[PDB]
Design a protein around this ligand. Sequence first.
Ligand SMILES: Cc1cc2c(C(C)C)c(O)c(O)c(C=O)c2c(O)c1-c1c(C)cc2c(C(C)C)c(O)c(O)c(C=O)c2c1O
Ligand SMILES: Cc1cc2c(C(C)C)c(O)c(O)c(C=O)c2c(O)c1-c1c(C)cc2c(C(C)C)c(O)c(O)c(C=O)c2c1O
Lengths: 56, 859, 113, 43
Amino acid sequence: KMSDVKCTSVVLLSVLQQLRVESSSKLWAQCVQLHNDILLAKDTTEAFEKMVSLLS
Amino acid sequence: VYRAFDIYNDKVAGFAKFLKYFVVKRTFSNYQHEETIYNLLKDCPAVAKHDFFPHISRQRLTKYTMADLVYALRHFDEGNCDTLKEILVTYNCCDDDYFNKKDWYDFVENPDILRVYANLGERVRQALLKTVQFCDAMRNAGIVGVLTLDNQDLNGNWYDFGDFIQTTPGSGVPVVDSYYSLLMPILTLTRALTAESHVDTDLTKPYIKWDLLKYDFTEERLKLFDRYFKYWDQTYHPNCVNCLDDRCILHCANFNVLFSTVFPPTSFGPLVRKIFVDGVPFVVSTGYHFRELGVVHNQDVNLHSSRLSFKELLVYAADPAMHAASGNLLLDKRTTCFSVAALTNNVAFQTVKPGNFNKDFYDFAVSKGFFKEGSSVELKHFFFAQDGNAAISDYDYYRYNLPTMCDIRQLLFVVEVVDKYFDCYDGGCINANQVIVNNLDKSAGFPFNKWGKARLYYDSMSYEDQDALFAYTKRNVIPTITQMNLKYAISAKNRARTVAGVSICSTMTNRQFHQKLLKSIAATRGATVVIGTSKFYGGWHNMLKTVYSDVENPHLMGWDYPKCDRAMPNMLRIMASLVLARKHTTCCSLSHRFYRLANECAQVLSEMVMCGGSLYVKPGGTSSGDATTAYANSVFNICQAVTANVNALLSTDGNKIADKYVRNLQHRLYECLYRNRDVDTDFVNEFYAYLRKHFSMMILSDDAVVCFNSTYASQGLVASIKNFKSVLYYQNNVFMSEAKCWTETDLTKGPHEFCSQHTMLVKQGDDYVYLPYPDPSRILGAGCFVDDIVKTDGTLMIERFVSLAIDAYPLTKHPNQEYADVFHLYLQYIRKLHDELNTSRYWEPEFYEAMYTPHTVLQ
Amino acid sequence: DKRAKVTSAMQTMLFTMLRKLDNDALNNIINNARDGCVPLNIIPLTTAAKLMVVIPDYNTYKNTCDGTFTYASALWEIQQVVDADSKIVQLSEISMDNSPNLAWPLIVTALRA
Amino acid sequence: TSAMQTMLFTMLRKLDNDALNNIINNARDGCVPLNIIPLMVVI
Ligand SMILES: Cc1cc2c(C(C)C)c(O)c(O)c(C=O)c2c(O)c1-c1c(C)cc2c(C(C)C)c(O)c(O)c(C=O)c2c1O
Ligand SMILES: Cc1cc2c(C(C)C)c(O)c(O)c(C=O)c2c(O)c1-c1c(C)cc2c(C(C)C)c(O)c(O)c(C=O)c2c1O
């Protein structure tokens, strides 16, 4: 069900950007790296790992 | 024993891979004459040794001659790429094992290929200077001849004598246009004469520490010519201000562009004297050293401008003088592009955010059967979000823009074949109120955008003022400052978007200069270019109808140019602008025309770019955010096409061909562009027609579709798929993978893709009509991903849904049902939306029916 | 009415950038040449003393701008230094050890010596 | 975005938060680190 995982990752990145976390650089760089790699998902479990690692 | 060649006899006049150190021959009078000429001309240090023993042999010849080099560059095939590889390896750029980098050939992936290529510029400049030696040896031995390329190995020492006729000494002129023109635009890829930036002009030495003031290089550039192009039988004007009207500028900017390298980048760009406006020593720009144009001294000059009004304030503020000079010097090690300074004393960054997702749409999809485990319609497109280093990482890409020449005796056909392709149009230097303002609230340039958009200025400058500015442009020059921001919109890839809002002034002049031609292309139908056409009402249908007016077997096919708005080469971007102006020769002085061309080639091909705060120099490309950009690269598209057709004709042995009309079309088109100089209206008209026959083109804003006889291309006559790429490579500095270009072989179905659309064949009214439909996933993604603010009033979102449904209505008729349910859900969606509040009722299938059947007449 | 405001802002920005530069070393260069035609890609290279360098990572902070330095055939003693997050940095941190802990683009604010 | 938790319910209905479960596991072995380990560990 990659559809729900992509949508959830998008709304999570949205609330993250809303949280005003743009202070640091490498944190947001890796964050958007995960986001760009979960919006392009071929497997649902890979998206699962990226999503759970990004949630924290 | 197959190589490249150049031939123009009475009948076969071609440039193709024709089939034919101590190369032995197999004639008596001819090799006798060869021996005699070799005995007359041998004491020049540019001639390969010969041997009269009927064998007229050579010696010390690179296995691949200069010809094959120029060819292999001109016709590159990632499939068949033996020659370019072998050359780049044998001559110390990298070893054969360098041929494993995925995308090694590319210019975006593996930009090391730039260095790999420049590893031969010395081998080039050597043969160049040898060639000039040979030209002088000929003129001072008194022989009339011709200068091809299959007769000079990669070292440079020419050979292959026995074709000319003994004249009397001191009186001899050779035909050179073939040589320097074919060989023209590679002296830039390898960056040939770069060695001449050193003290003895040698790498094993420091750079010439040029005075930090030397600007003109006029004498130096003429040294460059009298040393390299002393035999270009046309009055090269160091500054093309002295070239007569138009065909001479294309001939001469094509030389400043080459000599622009040997000189420091600290020397080009504007020229700032110091004007003492009521004493104040304003260091404003009163000149410009363009890389491709020359030392344009602004004729009009005004000291002691005691008072000031709108015109001169704008004229000067547009300059980079008062920013570059009077600004805290800025360095930036991120990029490779040259930098200048910074307005404010702190570098800046901008990060992009992700677009909002529409939940209700997703619910509708999951409930009505979409978004299921294996639906044929999945999601691929979203509103991405970018990180910190975005604007600058956006800017960096320009490193693909190598400055290149373009073969000038070949390009001395196409400017005018395109003149024909626009002949049926209007065109003139119209006045101010003759310019209907389109796209008002678009943008403005660095100083300007801080104060508004183009609308406030078009509200400011009264008519007479813009005409004063136009006259200025006819006799002055002004450079400008773009501002490359980032754009936020849905897509599938993970790169970033780039909007480039050029100055207000470049607009408020180019409009006055082109609006008539614009409108005249925005109101034709059945034309070749199709910008501004209607969108519905058999629109696509009648369009296709035109496209196959009288074609043989329609194997219709389209394409795309890799990164067009950045890798846009140099001489072609000028040709396009010059063709865009021959609609003035009843109103503008050829001087006005040159200075107008200069204003453009300053405000577009290279100017100032505020990249956050880091003012770099745009080394080329094309301003995406420019009005004339669309029709401009449409001209460029036709140019690329027309060229492809030229290279096709010449890339095909007429001997083996049995047809006879196009044969003596090709031979005389050779005679047209490479052997003579004057425009020959007969042949440009005939060839333009012949193109309108067998290669009907549909050209939208930088977007292309073509319909072409397939039989001709089986034997090779018109633009195939591979030739149009082999040319794109060596003239555009990008690479178009054949996998990214398609070919529909049965007109029963539409084009696989044009304007991002596929087309089907239905029976509306029991009629075989052609309807184009979008990608369903694209419409889906566009659905549940909202770009702008819509939560306040969904009006714009409602209209977005409407437009989606109008694109989707050609799915209702699509075979696959799920596709139709896409439209169905969109419909019911809009139904609920309007409920919350027939032909005005867009929540009825008949509205969407009206706007596609190919006979309706309404709004 | 706003047309007057924006046309005014043009030359206002002009004259104030002039004042922000206005000097005589500029005048010292203008007389060293002809009627004045001189490339604009050299003026701030000479008549400016507020060089700003954006250093991306470590491996260039070693082959390039360091802790005074010379560039543009001049001398530059490094003044206050700031990282990509607009925060102050001390020079001892720039080494292979603590490098992965700083906002990378290191903007310097050197002066001419 | 309050619906984030709403979609995270259905997410957890088929995920069991594999990495969060691994972290709670590492916490269950009595090896609770000084800080959360990037997705130190003492004893
Ligand atoms: C005008 C503008 C100026 C910007 C500037 C100035 C001050 C120079 C920045 O300095 C800058 O950094 C920007 C970047 O964020 C920046 C920018 O994004 C825009 C912009 C925006 C936001 C929306 C637009 C829309 C929306 C309603 C969707 C259009 O429909 C549209 O047509 C546009 C074009 O005309 C259009 C547009 O140009
Ligand atoms: C909705 C619409 C319907 C049209 C229809 C209907 C009745 C099917 C035609 O039949 C028709 O012929 C049209 C002409 O092309 C036509 C049309 O142009 C638009 C439209 C356009 C082109 C641009 C818009 C832009 C741009 C400047 C990007 C906005 O920024 C914006 O906000 C808009 C919303 O209000 C907005 C807009 O509505």
